């Protein structure tokens, strides 16, 4: 199994994937985010944020409260398993995390915390 995934967020507020499977043989897993299109970060910025499904709402809400300067993410949010920077068009960011941070049979979600974006920019991650 590949221990990485490449994901795009675009100018239509979409990710190009909404499911990630992480094989238990991976020690680490890398998410490579990019932003095709031409809208800048202050209007259409995207991140990739990974938490338990149960933690997503608090992460998203506290991210909105943290504002654009903090990449719409609460600093040192302990619920965040992995995060990229908030990127604008033509940029890219990668995050690597330890697969040991994923428990078996637990539900994970990934999402963008730019306000409003998680309506569409969300997806599910499991172990395999």
Among 43, 53, 65, 68, binds a second copy (CB under 8 A): 53
* DSSP codes of every residue in 108-127: EEEE--STTGGGTSEEEEEE
By CB under 5 A, what part of segment 25-84 binds Cu ion? 46
Non-local CB neighbours of 84 within 8 Å, separated by 6+ positions: 31, 33, 47, 48, 49, 93, 94, 95
By CB under 5 A, what part of segment 3-62 binds Na ion? none
d(CA 101, CA 104): 10
Least CB distance from residue 116 to Cu ion, whole Å?
8
- Which residues contact Na ion (rule: CB under 5 A)? 1
- Which residues contact a second copy (rule: CB under 8 A)? 18-19, 21-23, 53-54, 104-107, 123-124, 126-128
């Amino acid at each position: 199994a590949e221990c990485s995934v490449d994901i795009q967020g675009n100018d239509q507020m979409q990710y190009n994937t909404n499911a990630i499977t992480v094989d238990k043989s991976c020690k680490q897993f890398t998410v490579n985010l990019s932003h095709p299109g031409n809208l800048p970060k202050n209007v259409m910025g995207h991140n990739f944020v990974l938490s338990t499904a149960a933690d997503m709402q608090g992460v998203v809400t506290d991210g909105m409260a943290s504002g654009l300067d903090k990449d719409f993410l609460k600093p040192d949010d302990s619920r965040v398993i992995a995060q990229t920077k908030l990127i604008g068009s033509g940029e890219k960011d990668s995050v690597t995390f330890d697969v040991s941070k994923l428990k078996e049979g637990e539900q994970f979600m990934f999402f963008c915390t730019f306000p409003g974006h998680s309506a569409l920019m969300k997806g599910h991650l499991t172990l395999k």
